[PDB]
C-alpha cells in the first residue's frame, strides 16, 4: 500500500471472489515474521475460504 493507516484507524480491506497466490508472499523473504495461528502457512494455498 502507498500509505499504511495508524493503529487508531487501521485500514481494513475486504478480499472475496478471486483466487489468491499465497505462494509468492510466502516465498518472498521480505516478510521478516510470518506467524500463522489456526492454519499452517505451507498448505494455506490448499483450502477455500
Amino acid at each position: 500500500a502507498t500509505r499504511f493507516a495508524s493503529v487508531y484507524a487501521w485500514n481494513r480491506k475486504r478480499i472475496s471472489n478471486c483466487v489468491a497466490d499465497y505462494s509468492v508472499l510466502y516465498n518472498s523473504a521480505s516478510f521478516s515474521t510470518f506467524k500463522c495461528y489456526g492454519v499452517s502457512p505451507t498448505k494455506l494455498n490448499d483450502l477455500c475460504f
Binding site: A29, P41, T42
Partner: protein, 48 residues
C-alpha cells in the same frame, strides 16, 4: 551411542528457524531438522 556436529552459517532473518517444525527458505531448500529431533542447537554472532 553417537553424536553428530552439523556446522554452517546463517545471516539476516530466520537465525532462530533451525528447529523442528519450522518453515523458511533455508529450512525448505538447504537443511531441515526432523520432526522429533533430539539434541541441541547453538548459534552465535561471528561478524568479526
Amino acid at each position: 551411542t553417537n553424536v553428530y556436529a552439523d556446522s554452517f552459517v546463517i545471516r539476516g532473518d530466520e537465525v532462530r528457524q533451525i528447529a523442528p517444525g519450522q518453515t523458511g527458505k533455508i529450512a525448505d531448500y538447504n537443511y531441515k531438522l526432523p520432526d522429533d529431533f533430539t539434541g541441541c542447537v547453538i548459534a552465535w554472532n561471528s561478524n568479526n
